[PDB]
Amino acid sequence: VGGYTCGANTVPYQVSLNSGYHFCGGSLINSQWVVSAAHCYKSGIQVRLGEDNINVVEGNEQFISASKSIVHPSYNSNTLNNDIMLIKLKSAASLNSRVASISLPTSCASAGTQCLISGWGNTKSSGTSYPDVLKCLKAPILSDSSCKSAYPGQITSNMFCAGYLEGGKDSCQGDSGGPVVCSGKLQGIVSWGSGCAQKNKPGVYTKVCNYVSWIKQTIASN
Numbered sequence: 001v002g003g004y005t006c007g008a009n010t011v012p013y014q015v016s017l018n019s020g021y022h023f024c025g026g027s028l029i030n031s032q033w034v035v036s037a038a039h040c041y042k043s044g045i046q047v048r049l050g051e052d053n054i055n056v057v058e059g060n061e062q063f064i065s066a067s068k069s070i071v072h073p074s075y076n077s078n079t080l081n082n083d084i085m086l087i088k089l090k091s092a093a094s095l096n097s098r099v100a101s102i103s104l105p106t107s108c109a110s111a112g113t114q115c116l117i118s119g120w121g122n123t124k125s126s127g128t129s130y131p132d133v134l135k136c137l138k139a140p141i142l143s144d145s146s147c148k149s150a151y152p153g154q155i156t157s158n159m160f161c162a163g164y165l166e167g168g169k170d171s172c173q174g175d176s177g178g179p180v181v182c183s184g185k186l187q188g189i190v191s192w193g194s195g196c197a198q199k200n201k202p203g204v205y206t207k208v209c210n211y212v213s214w215i216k217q218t219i220a221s222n
């Protein structure tokens with residue numbers, strides 16, 4: 001896995017989901033909701049906002065319990081199709097410079113476009129920071145071909161790939177459910193893959209522009 005140390009609080013809509021330790025990432029959608037992967041679903045979530053070193057209290061955090069989890073109704077855990085969940089917060093977050101929502105898309109993104117991918121630990125440890133500090137990596141949306149060819153028979157409509165066609169770039173763990181953001185919109189969710197620094201295996205992401213109406217409705221229904 002590649003990318004670097006992001007900068008404490010440079011990705012204000014990043015969340016940590018903690019069940020007594022960090023187990024998945026997510027994104028603040030509005031002061032009462034988060035989105036993350038379905039794969040990440042579990043009972044007993046605490047949502048940590050404003051983190052950087054998840055192992056230290058450094059002053060900015062907000063810890064809020066989740067009060068409700070909605071996994072997408074046609075989520076399939078064998079193929080990971082529709083891998084997204086909404087998390088409603090027991091309380092509202094106060095938003096301020098370090099803790100901020102991120103906007104949903106109006107449009108889907110174009111291959112070629114360059115995004116930010118945020119999250120803790122791949123797994124590694126020492127590149128620069130900490131499995132402990134938030135890390136970042138920038139990488140382009142790939143073509144569908146490229147993606148499909150990378151994983152034949154597995155990619156659906158609700159996915160895209162991104163990164164580098166090899167020795168190009170891969171995250172690794174701890175990062176399921178975290179954001180992929182391109183020109184200021186949440187266009188992705190970290191979902192699976194089988195790469196990081198393996199070969200030319202991209203990651204695969206849940207294609208958020210697909211699920212905008214679900215999210216808005218649901219959220220407003222809950």
Ligand SMILES: *P(=O)(OC(C)C)OC(C)C
Pocket residue numbers: 023024025039040173174175176177191192
């Ligand atoms: P995600 O890859 O897989 C979860 C469904 C466990 O990685 C997590 C552990 C951050």
Ligand SMILES: [Ca+2]
Pocket residue numbers: 051052053054055056057058059061
């Ligand atoms: Ca902390």
